[PDB]
A paper describes a structure:
In the present study, we functionally characterized the hyperthermophilic M38 β-aspartyl peptidase FiBAP, a protein repair enzyme involved in hydrolysis of isoAsp residue-containing peptides in F. islandicum AW-1. The overall structure of each monomer can be divided into two distinct domains; an N-terminal β-sandwich domain (M1–G56; G344–E386) and a C-terminal catalytic domain (L57–K343), that are mainly involved in dimerization and catalysis, respectively. The catalytic domain at the C-terminus of the molecule folds into a (β/α)8 triosephosphate isomerase (TIM)-barrel motif.
Crystal structures of the ligand-free form of FiBAP and the ligand-bound form bound with N-carbobenzoxy-β-Asp-Leu (Cbz-β-DL) as a substrate analog were determined at resolutions of 2.6 and 2.7 Å, respectively. Cbz-β-DL-free and -bound structures belonged to I422 and P2212 space groups, with one and four subunits in the asymmetric unit, respectively. The ligand-free model included most amino acids except for residues D254–R259 and P290–L302, corresponding to the flexible loops in the molecule. Zn1 is coordinated by E156, H195, and H224 residues, while Zn2 is bound by H61, H63, E156, and D285. In the metal coordination network, Zn1 interacts with Zn2 via E156. In addition, E156 in FiBAP forms a cis-peptide bond with G155 in the loop between α4 and β10, which is conserved in the corresponding loop of CpIadA between G165 and E166. The cis-peptide bond favors loop bending in FiBAP, which positions E156 toward the metal, as opposed to the carbamylated lysine (KCX162) in EcIadA, suggesting that FiBAP belongs to the Type-I IadAs. Similar to EcIadA and CpIadA, size-exclusion chromatography indicated that FiBAP is an octamer in solution, usually referred to as a “tetramer of dimers”, as supported by symmetry-related molecule analysis. The initial dimer is formed when the β-sandwich domain of each monomer interacts with an adjacent monomer, mainly through hydrophobic interactions involving several residues (I2, I4, V34, V35, V38, L39, F41, and I46) in the loop between β4 and β5. Additionally, the substrate-binding cavity of the catalytic domain participates in dimerization by providing the second point of contact between adjacent partners through salt bridges. These four salt bridges are formed by E107 (α2), K114 (α2), R143 (α3), and D149 (α3) of each monomer of the dimer.
Residue numbers in the entry:
A (entry chain X), B (entry chain X), C (entry chain X), D (entry chain X): 1 to 253, 260 to 289, 303 to 386
Amino acid sequence: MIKIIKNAKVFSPEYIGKKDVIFYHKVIHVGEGVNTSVLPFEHEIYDANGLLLLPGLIDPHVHITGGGGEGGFETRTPELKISDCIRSGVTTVVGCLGTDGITRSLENLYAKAKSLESEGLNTFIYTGSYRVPPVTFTGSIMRDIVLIDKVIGVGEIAISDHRSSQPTLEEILRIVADIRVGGMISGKAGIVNFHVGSGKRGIEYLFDIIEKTEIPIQHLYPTHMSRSRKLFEQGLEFAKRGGTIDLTALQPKAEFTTIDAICEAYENGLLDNVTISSDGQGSDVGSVSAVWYTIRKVLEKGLPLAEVLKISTTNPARVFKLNKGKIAKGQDADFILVDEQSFEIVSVISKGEFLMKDGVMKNLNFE
Amino acid sequence: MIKIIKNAKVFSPEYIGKKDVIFYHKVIHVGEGVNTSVLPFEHEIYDANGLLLLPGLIDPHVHITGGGGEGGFETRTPELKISDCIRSGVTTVVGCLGTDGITRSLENLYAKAKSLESEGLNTFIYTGSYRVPPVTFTGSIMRDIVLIDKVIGVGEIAISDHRSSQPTLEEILRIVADIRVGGMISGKAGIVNFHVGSGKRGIEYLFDIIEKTEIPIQHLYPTHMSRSRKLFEQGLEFAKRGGTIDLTALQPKAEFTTIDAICEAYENGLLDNVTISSDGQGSDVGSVSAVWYTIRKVLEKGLPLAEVLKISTTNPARVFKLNKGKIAKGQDADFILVDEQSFEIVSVISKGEFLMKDGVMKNLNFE
Amino acid sequence: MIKIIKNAKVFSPEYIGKKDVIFYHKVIHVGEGVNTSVLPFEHEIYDANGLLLLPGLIDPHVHITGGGGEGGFETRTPELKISDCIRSGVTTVVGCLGTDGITRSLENLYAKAKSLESEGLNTFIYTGSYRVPPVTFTGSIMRDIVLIDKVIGVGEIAISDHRSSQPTLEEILRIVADIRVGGMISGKAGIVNFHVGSGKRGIEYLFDIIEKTEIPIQHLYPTHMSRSRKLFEQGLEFAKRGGTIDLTALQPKAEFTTIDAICEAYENGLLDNVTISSDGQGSDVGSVSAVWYTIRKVLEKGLPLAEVLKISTTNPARVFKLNKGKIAKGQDADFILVDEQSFEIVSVISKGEFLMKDGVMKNLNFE
Amino acid sequence: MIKIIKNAKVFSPEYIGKKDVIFYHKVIHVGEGVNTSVLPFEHEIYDANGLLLLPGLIDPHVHITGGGGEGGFETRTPELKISDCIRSGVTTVVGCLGTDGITRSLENLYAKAKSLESEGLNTFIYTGSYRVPPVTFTGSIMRDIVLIDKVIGVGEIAISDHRSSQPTLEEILRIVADIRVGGMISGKAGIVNFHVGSGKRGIEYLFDIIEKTEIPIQHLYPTHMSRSRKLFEQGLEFAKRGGTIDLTALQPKAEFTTIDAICEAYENGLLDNVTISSDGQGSDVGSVSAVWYTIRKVLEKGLPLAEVLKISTTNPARVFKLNKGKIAKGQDADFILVDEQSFEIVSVISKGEFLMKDGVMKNLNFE
Ligand SMILES: [Zn+2]
Ligand SMILES: [Zn+2]
Ligand SMILES: [Zn+2]
Ligand SMILES: [Zn+2]
Ligand SMILES: [Zn+2]
Ligand SMILES: [Zn+2]
Ligand SMILES: [Zn+2]
Ligand SMILES: [Zn+2]
């Protein structure tokens, strides 16, 4: 069914004011309200007066199958619920494994990514986990990314962390070169996602790769880059050379935060190089609710919405080479509708289907 | 802490009337109320007047990690919640895999069994899954049962079913001989659990094993044996030769049922050879609530409670060689307290800890 | 871009006469010509007056990477050209390997299927090849169909043929059970495609599977079933029990033919159980042109077009569980436009893109 | 059966003087003698007047399956007898392999650990042996510690020794990181036990791990650290940074000894960082009798018993995260009874069972 959203202020994410959006699975037309609209086929209309229309948020780091286990088997966290995603405005998720690559399987990660997609979400996964050498579906990360549609990279590889497998630079280079080449063969981005711990070495290895080899900076995507001011300023040096860094969203649950980090990146013209992620179901427990929460905390510091949205729409889309994050002709019909007063998510659209309409969740399988 | 339950009618499961139970992790003493009780150490007392004290129920067939997936990735079911167990009177669970041995891992089954145990449940697992040759932790089912404490058998191996891997008698015999010998080395029972489908061959192979080889009938534990009157009467022939059969509990959610099956087994003196199981989280969805529900439906047909309890206490304990299912000195302190009028579970004790006291659930990690 | 085809007689494949079709990637609306059509967005119109609009043809058996090699390395055939497909009306192809599973790789089959899809074709592949035990991407055919989107089955497994690996019934049953279960987990059909040679045993094993096991007849898809009258009459017995059989299309390049076979199946009410395939690039050389050629030869025997089209639209779609073969709302916009006089293919549409418009091929990469 | 020890002076190991101990498998109550004791259940009383009650000794390094073989097949030593343990006051043993990882199997180490436990001992094992890369049950040390209850670490890895496999720092770091992460997932300590030879490098690598990585010092447990004054003073530098070191007990069978080592550690406030071990059945032959012998030699130098006991109770318990080494409520009922005059072991209790009562050994299987 073709649908039309009328009377919303649209952030594309660039503010283009009051515009009407016609979509199937892809956006057909953005423009001024028709006012004849005599249409020769069945079609749905949604009155979004009072609402902002945004691109659906992209969370590029979620433990969709559950994580935890750093404190024993009793610290394993539950799997992601799609209902959590819908009421937090997240329409696209990138799932990985974490510390535990033994009791959490890649095949379960894939299966979970496929069931989230069935219920109307958009999903991609990494192969590997914290440990080097990385777990694989097929015996090599290069075969994983060539043969399995949803695999977009390897991650999250731990460096400068007490849970790392203490990988060498040589081991890292082989993994980065394999996912880069596998990316080229398969027409995918080929991302290495680095879990960066609090170790003094920080992102040394990332600088070593770009200085000592021909490997472009765009495959290297460190996260937890707001863990400390010192790490975040190593991050801005990495951005200045063309890199993108990921900051762990503020959880709804205190000196230097992701909020400070985002404000510094803006003042220095590097907000194009910054993503945020929930680390949802991570070790208590990441919520995907952290993404819209974190955007709302940055707005309250005076930053314009067209600019803040980059961290959860334009920037993750560029990193993963997705046709998402943009309301525009031929882009995929993934949108959230926010109340212009309260800024509460009231409607959520993915592939042009309402997952949520005016606070009313669609029908789900175990909810 | 040493505890005492006073003023309950005790089913051990044999009815021994009004008796007092003193326990730590194991039962210290069953007998008449002290009426001096001047005890030289800290100690808890529970007034169970109005309540029946039962042995904790043993569900020998639960998909603790989730199952389903027969209808695509959207039909994968969620993992078991310990809270479901507690309020359904199940203190012991035996976890297996089902149709899906690809996206459901053995290591996850183990990890889940370990976290249920941390929260106060008693857990055992099978190695393998539906498919022959069976998935293993270590490359052989015999090494699995010798090296991994919780592995008590292989299961559930599908026979006479459209989801089976069409196993031969020779393949079955090798698997049964391996789990029997692995059982002997490890001092465990060595159970083969057969998923029996609706195929015309039924439990042919089980009769073939005992008639044509030296393999004792006690390792062979078919389930879904109330699927049809014809299969259940093959089951009673199997019981008459010394076998135990498992019947899928009636789900709280219509000619020949598990209720009819249990009543026939009683009238023919074969209730000692019968277990029930929820198939909890199985493909809608098995609930562990099915076990106490099914016991309550048999009571309403006039069968005595001391006799019905055998299917969820004495019989599963004998099959798996567990020190459970009996309220008696040196047995493990696993009990339920039922209201003598309503027959509602009001308290649940495992290893002598209250998981539930007077409808009040203990503190759990993601609940 | 939204497009509309005006003034064609539409075969859906049921004849619904002069109707107008509005589509993006999926069909939006079939119905009577608008005659106001004032549409508030960019949109393309195609005047198909003089043309029949058909569903795009589905060829379920093509050696897309090349085949041959039965007569030495000089008998290897070239890979499929997408241009061959377009000018033969084939919009969907199912690619497999044949006799040679050594020098022809599965990963090449996948890569070729992906490049045909990029140029605008719709592609699926089998895992395996002629030989039992079958070649795999990941070490098991069950993992292949669960993990790799395009894998829809195993094939083509040779039986009753001098190039077979002389597989046993037990080996066949394990392979059929694995692809059936892998199908259920992955939400795909799980087809076993049998290459049937001229050996006296014919499709004995197929009857053995359905008579002796619980395995439904719909997974079993023999081809070359018009090789002889005797084999084809074994085929009609298989159809009468619910099976679908595949007949090798007549090549444009003499007693009992595929034409006779199709006419017999119609007179006996079994045309619903019949597909044809080119065996394109097969050992001279199969052409995908055989499909439309074979449909044209059946029309010249007086059979109605709505009925003949079933063999290349409805029937392959049902076998592979595809949303193809039907012009109807929500179905994928794959169509051919035929001249009503000459019956020459003049336009070809896949995912709503013109691969060919009025004899003019789109822009291709090495053509 | 509940039991009570009356009239002993209790070292917990802190001296708490004349106290009474009530226990099942765990200690129920420590306190002043009841003097009413009218107890409503069967119960055993032991008159320990004239005896000191100590926590059962923990020997964290025993070749329970036999060792030796450095001088050819004729130098293989016999397996440990449980009777040796009982009459030497050792109630807990940690078993490993040594030089020979070829003819001594891990599965035998496990089996031996299980049979010692059956006869009433408490047992844990390491995976691996001297050689890097280390032998495993399952193909990785991380899977070994997650899947096998008794595996508490990897050991004993040889460094600075002529029998080492000359491991690199990188190989060591991977092994330490794997056992640390496997420890976290499994809720176990994750110990690397280093056999330190007489090579000039000593424990260089241990300092390299803590200085150059985020890996905490508590996983690193070198032994033979009294082999020389020079090595022992490297050991005290390691203790000063938070490490625990192991000293080979003096064998009952001459400048710088374990006695000197323990006295130096006390004078410098580092006795909390010191364990001793028999190296029992090691290459003549370690005896587990060395542990109580070595404690008796330190007492004869004037050190107080509450302090000396730390090396065989509190310190090994902290290293391995065991609920042992403490006489206290909820701790496991493992105790020795010593004659206050002669200091001879006269009774030994494990899990609250008498292995030895007044010089009378319990009934054993091949003794
Ligand atoms: Zn992380
Ligand atoms: Zn993470
Ligand atoms: Zn079943
Ligand atoms: Zn089941
Ligand atoms: Zn063929
Ligand atoms: Zn072929
Ligand atoms: Zn040593
Ligand atoms: Zn040693």
